[PDB]
Amino acid sequence: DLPLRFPYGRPEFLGLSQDEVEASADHIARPILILKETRRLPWATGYAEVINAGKSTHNEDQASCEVLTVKVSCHYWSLFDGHAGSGAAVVASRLLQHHITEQLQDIVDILKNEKKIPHECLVIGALESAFKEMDLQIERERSSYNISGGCTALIVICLLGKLYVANAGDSRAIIIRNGEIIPMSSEFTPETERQRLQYLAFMQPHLLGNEFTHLEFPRRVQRKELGKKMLYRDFNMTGWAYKTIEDEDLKFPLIYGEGKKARVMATIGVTRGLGDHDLKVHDSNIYIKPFLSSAPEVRIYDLSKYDHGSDDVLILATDGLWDVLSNEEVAEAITQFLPNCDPDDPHRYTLAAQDLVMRARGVLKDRGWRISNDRLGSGDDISVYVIPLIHGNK
Amino acid sequence: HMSDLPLRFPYGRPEFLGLSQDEVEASADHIARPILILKETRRLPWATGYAEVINAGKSTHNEDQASCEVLTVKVSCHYWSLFDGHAGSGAAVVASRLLQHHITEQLQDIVDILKNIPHECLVIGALESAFKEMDLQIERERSSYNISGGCTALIVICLLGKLYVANAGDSRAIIIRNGEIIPMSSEFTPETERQRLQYLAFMQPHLLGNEFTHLEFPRRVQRKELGKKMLYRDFNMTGWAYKTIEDEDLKFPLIYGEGKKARVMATIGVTRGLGDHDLKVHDSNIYIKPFLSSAPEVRIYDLSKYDHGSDDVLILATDGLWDVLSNEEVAEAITQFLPNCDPDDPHRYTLAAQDLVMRARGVLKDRGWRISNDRLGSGDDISVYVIPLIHGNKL
Ligand SMILES: [Mg+2]
Ligand SMILES: [Mg+2]
Ligand SMILES: [Mg+2]
Ligand SMILES: [Mg+2]
């Protein structure tokens, strides 16, 4: 009905032209696109991506990477895993950096120059406000532009010799530094956020629409067990204890499923990010957005405290990577791939990124996408940054 | 009112001290501040050490309470507990007598699973429910008995070779194992709980009674700054950003202060525990209890992954100790003291407990109580358990 805020596409730094773009969206070939060696990114950052194995017509991942000027320079990398549409992810790929820039400008003069407030806390609050302000802008432009769906957001900035990794979703950032894995992010899923979700449904039961219960049970409760004792978990418990099933325990659980496929209100499997303002429950007028948050967790890495080698890297990747490769596998692939490349070859990290995507996507024969050890490959969109920390050395 | 009701229990010191009430009287001296230790004639489970000392004058009674016994689930469950009472001794006395019965009963619900979802998660759950049920019982009995004030609750059980440390308050548990400090709990303060507190006030603004705002500011906002930009911090923020000050920012902050002066609606400086069901904001009608919680955090230490020594101890203490002694000073004091008593001396850990209390309490000057390096001594009630992990070893 309404116009697109921006045309759909792939990251601008891939310099694709719209016929290249549609050769990319091949669900059976799944071509791995990489940054052309002729186009260098900040810090010679490597990038690689690939479309899902069928579940959405378009690659709903997006990514932006550039050097911001704050009136000081600020390096920037972003990944947005869109869902239920490409809209939010494209909008955030273009506009979040503007919000980050505006928030940093409020505080840039404190940075170059009664609760005591460290300067990092100002930078963190600028990122925190920037995510909040990117939402809101999506919220208010919903009714004028077709900004479909929702997206997670994972961004990194390098400001004054520190990395700030700010995550609101289930993408993941890790540093691989001389083989050790430094996690720079945590995921926001119905699993990791259960207590927050439960407590909010408890404090505001009208958000459940008399269709869900905020209590969590080992398996689905059917009227079969009404009046029997059963294990339950409330927002205040990490553990389990017994309760007599008392009618309302019959409703669909607010949190259901195990692990990576736990879902809030039978609908969404990630609890933070942007968009999803009008997202409702399957065939229902219950809104999901009260339960989601745009608020990112922000972690800091001081680049000045370590002399990083050619192989010490920050990996940014959407769940498409991490859904099949552990942190340890990614570290093993990185540390085994990069020593085979000339350390002064600017393409190194793109090829490392291509290696990671390859190892998560796999090869399609007749048994579906398989990676190493005959494991199912990832059928999701996969986007990978490989950021060489050697260019952040003081 | 509660003042018209009889006491649920008479005031006393921990039962296991076997103090006659002449001895109890002798112990509530605020000038000599006598350090009470466990009589060698009364052994505690695991030869557990215990020492305590009354506050320097800020309340007529020692408002700490402590309970130590071997419970039986119908299996054996060792139980140590500290309650830092406030605004009265009633909650802490009641909790020191009745929380164990809630624990026993919640454990009975899962005892058959234990000796025949991970099992730890069931023990954890029982503790979390027991705390909720010890509150609630206080909440109902409130109407028939004078269960004054509130208290924090730090408890430890040993069940089937694991220690569960359930903390709701600002007492602290640490293991000192071969000189290293293994933290077994986190305090629940207006600072550590800021975002929970702010978000609850955001969700339920009626809890502020139009006297408070949920936003935090680097200092108290003055009316003079209406319309100007100021750093603020909201519930979803760890950092600070700018905002224009808008009338509602002039209300008194929900969280204001730093360290132990940090307070919630200018009334309470600890945010978890039992009791306080009728606690109200300083001169007013705003109830504090909606922001309080009885839910402990539970941490597990597996007593089989390590063959513990004579000097490997779990230290439980109320903030009377941790307010003037850091974890490392406590570790310094344990590792310096315990090597100097016969390993087979059953009074070993009570003496270490006493030494900890004494190192926190200090000596009396014309200026007040001072510890080492002319530092100010603790003026609070101090209660310390030294629990020797050697008694938790395999087999
Ligand atoms: Mg997606
Ligand atoms: Mg994905
Ligand atoms: Mg007290
Ligand atoms: Mg105290």
Numbering used by the authors:
A (entry chain B): 34 to 104, 142 to 183, 232 to 512
B (entry chain A): 31 to 104, 142 to 183, 235 to 513
Original authors' sentences:
To grow WT crystals and improve diffraction, a “loop deletion” variant of PPM1H (PPM1H‐LD) was designed to eliminate a flexible and non‐conserved loop (188‐226) that was predicted to be distant from the active site. WT and D288A variants of PPM1H (PPM1HWT‐LD, PPM1HDA‐LD) diffracted to 2.5 Å and 2.6 Å resolution, respectively. The 2.5 Å model of PPM1HWT‐LD will be used for ensuing discussions, except for 3‐D docking analyses with model substrates in which we used the MnPPM1HWT‐LD variant. The structure of PPM1H adopts a conserved PPM fold consisting of 10 β‐strands organized into a 5 × 5 β‐sandwich. The active site cleft is formed by loops, including a short α‐helical loop (α4, residues 443–447), that connect β‐strands on one edge of the β‐sandwich. Three conserved aspartate residues—D151, D437 and D498—form direct contacts with two Mg2+ ions (M1 and M2) at the active site. M1 is coordinated by D437 and D498, while D151 coordinates both metal sites. The metal binding includes water molecules, and the geometry is approximately octahedral for both metal sites (M1 and M2). Deletion of the loop 188‐226 and the N‐terminus (1–32) does not affect the ability of PPM1HWT‐LD to dephosphorylate pRab8a relative to the full‐length enzyme in vitro and in cells. Using size exclusion chromatography coupled to multi‐angle light scattering (SEC‐MALS), we showed that PPM1HWT‐LD is a dimer.
